[PDB]
Amino acid sequence: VPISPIETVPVKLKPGMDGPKVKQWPLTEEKIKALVEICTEMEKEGKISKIGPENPYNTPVFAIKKKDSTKWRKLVDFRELNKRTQDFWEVQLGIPHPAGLKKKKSVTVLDVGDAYFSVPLDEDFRKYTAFTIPSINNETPGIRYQYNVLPQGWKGSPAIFQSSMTKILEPFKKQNPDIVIYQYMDDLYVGSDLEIGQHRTKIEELRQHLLRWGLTTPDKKHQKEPPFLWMGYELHPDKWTVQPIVLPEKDSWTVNDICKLVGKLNWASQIYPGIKVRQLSKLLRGTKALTEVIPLTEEAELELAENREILKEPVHGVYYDPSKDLIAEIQKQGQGQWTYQIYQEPFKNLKTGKYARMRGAHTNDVKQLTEAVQKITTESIVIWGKTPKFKLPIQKETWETWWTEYWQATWIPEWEFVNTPPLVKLWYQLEKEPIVGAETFYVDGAANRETKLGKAGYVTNKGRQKVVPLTNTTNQKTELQAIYLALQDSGLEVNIVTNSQYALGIIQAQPDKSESELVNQIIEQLIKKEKVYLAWVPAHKGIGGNEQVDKLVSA
Amino acid sequence: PIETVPVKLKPGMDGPKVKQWPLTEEKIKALVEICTEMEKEGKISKIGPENPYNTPVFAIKKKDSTKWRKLVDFRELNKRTQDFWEVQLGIPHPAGLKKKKSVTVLDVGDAYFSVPLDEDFRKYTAFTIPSINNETPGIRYQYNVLPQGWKGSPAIFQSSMTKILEPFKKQNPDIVIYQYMDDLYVGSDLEIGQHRTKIEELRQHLLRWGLWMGYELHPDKWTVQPIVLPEKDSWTVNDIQKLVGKLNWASQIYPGIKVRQLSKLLRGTKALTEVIPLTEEAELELAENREILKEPVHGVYYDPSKDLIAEIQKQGQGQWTYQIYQEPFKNLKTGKYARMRGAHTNDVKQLTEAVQKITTESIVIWGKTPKFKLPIQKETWETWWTEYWQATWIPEWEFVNTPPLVKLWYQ
DNA sequence: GGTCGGCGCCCGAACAGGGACTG
DNA sequence: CAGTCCCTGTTCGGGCGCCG
Ligand SMILES: CSCC[C@H](NP(=O)(O)CO[C@H](C)Cn1cnc2c(N)ncnc21)C(=O)O
Numbered sequence A: 001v002p003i004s005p006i007e008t009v010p011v012k013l014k015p016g017m018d019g020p021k022v023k024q025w026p027l028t029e030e031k032i033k034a035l036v037e038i039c040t041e042m043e044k045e046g047k048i049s050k051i052g053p054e055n056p057y058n059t060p061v062f063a064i065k066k067k068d069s070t071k072w073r074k075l076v077d078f079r080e081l082n083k084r085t086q087d088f089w090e091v092q093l094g095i096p097h098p099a100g101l102k103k104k105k106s107v108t109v110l111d112v113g114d115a116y117f118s119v120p121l122d123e124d125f126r127k128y129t130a131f132t133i134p135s136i137n138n139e140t141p142g143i144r145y146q147y148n149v150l151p152q153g154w155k156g157s158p159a160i161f162q163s164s165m166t167k168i169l170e171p172f173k174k175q176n177p178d179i180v181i182y183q184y185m186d187d188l189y190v191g192s193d194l195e196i197g198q199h200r201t202k203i204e205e206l207r208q209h210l211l212r213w214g215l216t217t218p219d220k221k222h223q224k225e226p227p228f229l230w231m232g233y234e235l236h237p238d239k240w241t242v243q244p245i246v247l248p249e250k251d252s253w254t255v256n257d258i259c260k261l262v263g264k265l266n267w268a269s270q271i272y273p274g275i276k277v278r279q280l281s282k283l284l285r286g287t288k289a290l291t292e293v294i295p296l297t298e299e300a301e302l303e304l305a306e307n308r309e310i311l312k313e314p315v316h317g318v319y320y321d322p323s324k325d326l327i328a329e330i331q332k333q334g335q336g337q338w339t340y341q342i343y344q345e346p347f348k349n350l351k352t353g354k355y356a357r358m359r360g361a362h363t364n365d366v367k368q369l370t371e372a373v374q375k376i377t378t379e380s381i382v383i384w385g386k387t388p389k390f391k392l393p394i395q396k397e398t399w400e401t402w403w404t405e406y407w408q409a410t411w412i413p414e415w416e417f418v419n420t421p422p423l424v425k426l427w428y429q430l431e432k433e434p435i436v437g438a439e440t441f442y443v444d445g446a447a448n449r450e451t452k453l454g455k456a457g458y459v460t461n462k463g464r465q466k467v468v469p470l471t472n473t474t475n476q477k478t479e480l481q482a483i484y485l486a487l488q489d490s491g492l493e494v495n496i497v498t499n500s501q502y503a504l505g506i507i508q509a510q511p512d513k514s515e516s517e518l519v520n521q522i523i524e525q526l527i528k529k530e531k532v533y534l535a536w537v538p539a540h541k542g543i544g545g546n547e548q549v550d551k552l553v554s555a
Numbered sequence B: 001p002i003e004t005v006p007v008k009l010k011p012g013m014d015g016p017k018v019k020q021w022p023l024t025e026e027k028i029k030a031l032v033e034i035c036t037e038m039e040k041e042g043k044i045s046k047i048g049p050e051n052p053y054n055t056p057v058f059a060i061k062k063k064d065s066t067k068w069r070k071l072v073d074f075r076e077l078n079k080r081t082q083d084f085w086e087v088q089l090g091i092p093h094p095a096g097l098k099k100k101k102s103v104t105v106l107d108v109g110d111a112y113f114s115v116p117l118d119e120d121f122r123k124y125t126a127f128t129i130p131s132i133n134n135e136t137p138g139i140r141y142q143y144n145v146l147p148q149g150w151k152g153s154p155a156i157f158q159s160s161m162t163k164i165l166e167p168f169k170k171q172n173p174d175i176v177i178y179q180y181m182d183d184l185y186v187g188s189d190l191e192i193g194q195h196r197t198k199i200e201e202l203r204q205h206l207l208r209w210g211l212w213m214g215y216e217l218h219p220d221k222w223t224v225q226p227i228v229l230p231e232k233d234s235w236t237v238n239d240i241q242k243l244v245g246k247l248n249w250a251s252q253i254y255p256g257i258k259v260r261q262l263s264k265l266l267r268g269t270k271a272l273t274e275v276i277p278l279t280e281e282a283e284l285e286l287a288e289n290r291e292i293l294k295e296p297v298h299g300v301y302y303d304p305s306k307d308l309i310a311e312i313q314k315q316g317q318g319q320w321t322y323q324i325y326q327e328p329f330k331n332l333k334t335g336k337y338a339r340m341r342g343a344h345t346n347d348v349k350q351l352t353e354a355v356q357k358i359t360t361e362s363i364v365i366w367g368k369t370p371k372f373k374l375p376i377q378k379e380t381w382e383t384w385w386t387e388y389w390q391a392t393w394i395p396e397w398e399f400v401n402t403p404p405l406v407k408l409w410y411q
Numbered sequence C: 001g002g003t004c005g006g007c008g009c010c011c012g013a014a015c016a017g018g019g020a021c022t023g
Numbered sequence D: 001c002a003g004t005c006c007c008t009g010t011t012c013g014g015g016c017g018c019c020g
């Protein structure tokens, strides 16, 4: 076997484990002909070699059809070898995006045919990549081969190929620094600002540079004219868009059909603005069977019909001009949902997106907006390497009050207020000083761990009092209930004194939405007030009415 | 032609496998220009995916510094080699460094590149450089010399460093020199002028051996932030309720704090804004509690074997308080910062500045870096903290969410 | 078909660590 | 006192989408 021009990558097995020994799957006769036709062709090209009984290893093998072609793709079920193969560090750190491409005078795309079959495998590791090709007769012993290149299905092949491909492109890109080569596996996006005459030469130079190492660039996959098909998009000289997306129109929806729908909706949200998958993802909660039929809710049918109407109109993104600033604008869509557009010129979106994660049992719009800004910031650094300037639906004075008075550290990068309702705001403000002339409520609540019974109430400075029995409750629920009672029975201004750190900590964070309906009721009462002053005192110290109302709610 | 010092990981532990986080354009261009030049000098060489280890990498600029500085987050590799730089080649910590009138810091990380690294250990120094928009796969490297930011580098170079500093230590015996990570702490009681001159004498003394910049500290002027009680002519029910709760919390630190007579003033269900005259029994309980807060806590002393812990509280208006301790309520030091960079506009820049100042003080006083409890959300911190980092070390930290109780540390 | 690696989303279960009450 | 549980937050396993 001749030596490949590419330097091999030394690969070891994990210490203390041998190669795989798995029996071959029963293959269809139409797939057997495709394998023997490919195996005999790769054997002639030196990519696989015959092996005798001295190789005690074996692994299953199969094949799937290539998309939009009559050719076949050979795949190996290396699930047992991948378990016992050494760990690799993947060099593919992410996926390129067209919104990060800059305008170039010339663009060329070309794919490498049978990319894994042109990069050699480690000589000492080829013995473990043994497989058996079953013949048309079950009594025939079959032909046994071993891989001399990178197999398809082994966990090390993609990491080895990407590093090998980068090493071969280094001498060309070093000699041609003004040539941009987007390298995703074997897909090469080549662009330049050279004149179109000199560009065609450099493309041919690159096709020969790759040819000197065994990498073939077929003229079939060669692309010289726009629109270019690259990474699932359509690249035009002035704009880009995703390749056509098809959503299923099932009359009876299963759980797996929703997962296929939700995934395509997320994929479409990168350029199609306003995609919502809140109500459709609510169909996947608490469900077990992937094939179980589930009916669409009224909120899910409306959300789906809105997404289909957005996908009817054509949308496109633009490319990145480093000479102009990056701008990200966010909108409060639904409760818990946020959308954003990243652009440089008005209505010329580089890309779009959405944020809808619910963090914690109690939150407000300011927290979620801060989380969305961070998600966009990290996303922008990946694509453009910089943080955009933000346009946020929150008053400058609103944000100033929040971050200065909040006990956690928080910050938003350089941003400006855009007046687009609904505007994010704080729905209520706790006073920093006790209110003169307002009734002072001393609240407390307790419960029993066993009987699950408890009391909640208050004692005020005007003699007002209340105690309410509670069933199936906790110490935390009662102490929240006592504050809720003091809010119901007070005027527009009230001073409330509690000893519950748990209850006080939740309210001071100014939540406007909660998983607990009790907290929501507390919120609704807090919004109706004009001045609220909460205050904490230590318990069991005989302080004011806190000791009196503790003995009242003792049982 | 230098012999390598054999280094091993701790028994039953593998190397670091930490994913690289996204980097800005200015940091990637800086890292490429630095790593290309470091490869040209043999300090690093490219590797492949067969190395399963990796450590994050980013770039910083020190205070008033224009040049970018490569920084590797070797925190995970340092945890997995702890027995090396503590048991075998430990570096003693001078107790007099904190008592000097002036202490200057010198970045001597460039000297580590002169010593080769053990061949078997180079596999763990791996790191990957990302690309904008993932134009190319990751460009992986590994170190061929002693890496900056690794706690094994000053331990191996310790023998070489002692012989370089011996001529200077002999001429200047009253000057204290401490080496922590890539930094050199030089402390003296000299006048500012001749002190900075003695620094420049050491700078030229280090240039002739194959090695700049200084950060001045004055540990003698480091002050602590005690627990203070308000001095009011008129007290209200709310004032005394807040006073009792604060004294109740402070009683966990000072066992002599009493709130009996003060709680007796809060017997009735009174309005918060009502003025309450202090009884003479309560006035003495308040004055005696003030006297206790001036005296130090009993049985508080540093333990060399225990980890340092640092808590930070956001007090608003650019105020930031902190306490350093090893056991709860046994604070080895308390303090307060104010008017730092980013005050009244950027909490993360202020918090980043606070962590650096606290870590710097912990190195001078004990020679350790504390683990921080940060009053910030994890995603808020991990999004911006590298934008404001100006130090060659990185402390360990965790994130807490403690809503304010009784403002114990700031009036 | 039920191969691999990357990145993204959604969900629930398992993990985990602090706070107030109890033998 | 240590030992619960009530509560809350984080991490991870697994499905889909997308690319080669
Ligand atoms: C019209 S289908 C695309 C044709 C493609 N081109 P290629 O070989 O140059 C480059 O692909 C390499 C092998 C990556 N890779 C792609 N798909 C798979 C897969 N399913 N399993 C494992 N590795 C895969 C091919 O042949 O796989």
Ligand SMILES: [Mn+2]
Residues within 6 Å of the ligand: A111, A112, A113, A114, A115, A186, A187
């Ligand atoms: Mn190809």
Ligand SMILES: [Mn+2]
Residues within 6 Å of the ligand: A444, A445, A446, A479, A499, A550
């Ligand atoms: Mn209670």
